[PDB]
């Protein structure tokens, strides 16, 4: 494995990554280890941090990819996008949009 | 004028493997281990699940972090410090944020920095509520290797007189 | 000739309950109830999430029963002797097996069932690794309550010289 | 709650039931008390011990009704039965019958 790292180890894994690509902690059982990704798996959103970048998991309710933690882009088939976030249907005080699926 | 420092108490760290039968039991394997308290941390009895945690994991970018079970017991393998310049948090900070996740003690490997050690057994940052555990040489690399090929342990900190 | 008992030591049960921050951290207020270690089982601090256990949950059946995670700490609280003319098991042998099926530790209401206590301080069958404590009263009706409300919380029996 | 029970409490709930009934540990977070069930719920099958009757979860993968531990009657819609057992494709040694889906 080990691909990626500017440094890496065999007990943690990668430890800082390379300039352009995104930290990403695989847990994998008692184990957490680093990878040094091209772009975030899917389930994850990257941040581009002054630092370091990094992955982050998405926990958006029925999206399927997170940009930042708090906006969806592409929610699931069956659902309405509202202030970022994914609906069944959709909340009240506003309703759906004719040839559209927002709100 | 103080003196040759009280040594620092042993922390017998029993590990725990398992297996799980069809119909409903468990056989248990034992594995003693053996570390010190630090000033850093209590010097109770602390029991748990063990989990890794990479030392860049633990750092406070506000960013919301998994939710681990209550309980678990932080194993953390630090890296020689020229590999890391300017570290988010001290060594001391990465126990506390442990706690914060849900750690009920924390347990650092400090083989390959042991000034680490004295950066623990310094005191002048609050000490924690929860137990801070220091290993190394092949107690250490006992521990690791658990970890990394076993499915599941528990460990058991004890404390006697 | 034996004289009186050495006075059975106290077992200082300490009782975690836990929320959840959205980011991930664990705000926790902690409870401390008492009881006593006996004969039957270790005395040793031992950690781990609470279960209840039905007095009849646990039996000899050799029915395959359900896998809960290993390290969990059993609460059983027993029934008027009247109630239940034959027992599957002794006390003793419910005991033994929580433990079979992963109990770390056990704790016994005894409030409505002295001879129990007795019972424990025996000590003629063969005496487990894993602690087995005794409660009653204020402490044991404590308990019952969180069990009852709660959804989730975390016992550490502690011990003390 | 507490139907069903010869004795009831009220931290265990039924303790012991009535004669032809069956005993169910309902298993509720950190809880667990006695249920006393004309039949068994749905996931499980019940034994007729000598001394009580008493309700036991399925575990045969693919079962929608367990008779005993070791035996499913009725298999998952789309599998095979055999020896008890259910399978998505019927194991090595022996293959379908023609208009009937044992083996």
């Given at each position: 494995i080990c691909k990626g790292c500017l440094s890496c180890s065999k007990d943690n894994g990668c430890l800082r990554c390379q300039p352009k690509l995104f930290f990403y902690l695989r847990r994998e059982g008692m184990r957490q280890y680093g990878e040094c990704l091209q772009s975030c798996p899917p389930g994850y959103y990257g941040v581009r941090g002054p630092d370091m970048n990094r992955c982050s998991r998405c926990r958006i309710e029925n999206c399927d990819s997170c940009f930042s933690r708090d906006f969806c882009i592409k929610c699931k088939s069956g659902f309405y996008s509202h202030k970022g976030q994914c609906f069944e249907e959709c909340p009240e005080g506003f309703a759906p949009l004719d040839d559209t699926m927002v709100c | 004028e103080t003196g040759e420092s009280l040594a620092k108490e042993t922390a017998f760290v029993e590990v725990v493997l398992f297996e799980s039968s069809p119909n409903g039991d468990y056989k248990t394997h034992t594995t003693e281990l053996q570390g010190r308290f630090s000033?850093?941390?209590?010097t109770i009895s602390a029991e748990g699940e063990i989990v890794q945690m990479h030392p860049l994991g633990l750092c406070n970018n506000n960013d919301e972090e998994d939710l681990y079970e209550y309980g678990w017991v932080g194993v953390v393998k630090l890296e020689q410090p020229e590999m890391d310049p300017k570290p988010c948090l001290t060594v001391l900070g990465k126990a506390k944020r442990a706690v914060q996740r849900g750690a009920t003690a924390v347990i650092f490997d400090v083989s390959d920095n042991p000034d680490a050690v004295e950066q623990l057994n310094q005191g002048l940052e609050d000490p924690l509520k929860r137990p801070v555990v220091y290993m190394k040489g092949m107690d250490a690399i006992k521990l690791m290797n658990i970890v990394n090929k076993q499915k599941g342990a528990r460990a058991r900190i004890q404390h006697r007189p």
């Open positions: - | 000033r850093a941390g209590a």
